[PDB]
Paper text:
Here, we present biochemical and structural evidence that POA inhibits Mtb PanD in a competitive fashion and that it binds with a high degree of complementarity to the active site of the enzyme. PanD is a proenzyme and in the structure, we observed the processed active enzyme after cleavage between Gly24 and Ser25, and modification of Ser25 to a pyruvoyl group (Pyr25). The active protein consists of a β chain (Met1-Gly24) and an α chain (Pyr25 to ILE115). Our results show that resistance to PZA in PanD mutants primarily comes from alterations in two loops covering the active site that have subtle, but significant effects on the affinity and residence time of POA on the enzyme rather than from directly affecting POA binding interactions.
Crystals of Mtb PanD were produced using the hanging-drop vapor diffusion method. The first 115 residues were clearly visible in the electron density map, while the last 24 residues could not be built due to the flexibility at the C-terminus.
Author numbering:
A (entry chain D), E (entry chain D): 25 to 116
B (entry chain C), D (entry chain A), F (entry chain C), H (entry chain A): 1 to 24
C (entry chain B), G (entry chain B): 25 to 115
The structure:
């Protein structure tokens, strides 16, 4: 895979090659792949390769990354949650 | 004891393109 | 995603954002998502977003969390198992 | 060497609601 | 979930509550659940709850557990691989 | 750097029973 | 499971028993299994057991391994990417 | 805090064989 606008990767704290779960709100598909850095500020969310069978252009998706962390850190950790407009630009 | 926790979420993004035969 | 009654989260030792596996007894669906804290004592089990395609209101579900732990602790660890009535209240 | 172990289980809960278009 | 004969759990180095992947040779189903200790020497392989939708009595299954381990240990670690007869008894 | 490795495999076991409505 | 040519395993930094994700470009199947060392230089990509239901001879596949690593290493880590010809020989 | 990162990829390999009833 999934090409993500570098702005959304920074906003979401995702690295190139970090494991990502994609869930499709339109068809209910769920898959695991990895993040590729996309052209900054382009609003690109690009499905590459085998995933294109399951996730289609115009589908609304949720992109999720998880981390393993000790009990103490888990209770205090604040996850980076990025809401976006119809053009994939971050919102308040 | 380590827990698996949500760290990142991009909520309701729109898929812009798809290429079955991508090489990269 | 899954909104869980804060009482069930405390009972089951789940944090907000902890990864959760939902298995559906009614339709056999199995998915991975994360826990959101729901109104305490409401008995809420709310499926949010894409998961709602697979897991439906009225379905009986099992919610499961796993942990990574060293060999030594794994052999002794006692999991928190929460039984609930038809109204999602602990027993 | 880390094993993945069951830590939590809520057994036979009833799904009360669902929202396809949830924001949060 | 999956109830496993304690002999197979010892043979395979599985603990009660350890995460297990079941793959179904008959129908191609793949699911993740956890091990429950079954009556020793009974040859029990019991599918409990939601999994019964996917994995059926008489199906041939493979039960798999994975571990996270440092590079050095990964190169030397010997996995415990248990072959069984039609009655779920260990074989040489 | 940690790898995910096979540690256990029970090869070609026969499912003996199934109970949709198990409680335990 | 998946039997891989020892050359591709060395090229991709995979050990026998390392967890591998197979994604099928032809039918969109996605599964998790582990690597078995195949005859070196044979170009073998062999699907063994239950996986054979989903991933078929002649299919184009991507084989993926993931690693757990501390924040610091994750930001600098360079993955091993192996391109292959139609005969499964590295480039 | 551990991230899961891509470490290995064999891109567009051709499946040569398959055995439903493999023993090993």
């Amino acid at each position: 895979x999934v090409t993500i606008d570098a702005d959304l990767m920074d906003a979401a704290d995702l690295l190139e090659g970090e494991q990502v779960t994609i869930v499709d709100i339109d068809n209910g598909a769920r898959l695991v792949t990895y993040a590729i850095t996309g052209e900054r500020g382009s609003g690109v969310i690009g499905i590459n390769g085998a995933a294109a069978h399951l996730v289609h252009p115009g589908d609304l998706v949720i992109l999720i990354a998880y981390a393993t962390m000790d009990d103490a850190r888990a209770r205090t950790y604040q996850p980076r949650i990025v809401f976006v407009d119809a053009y994939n630009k971050p919102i308040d | 004891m380590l827990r698996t926790m949500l760290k990142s979420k991009i909520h309701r993004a729109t898929v812009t393109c798809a290429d079955l035969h991508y090489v990269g």
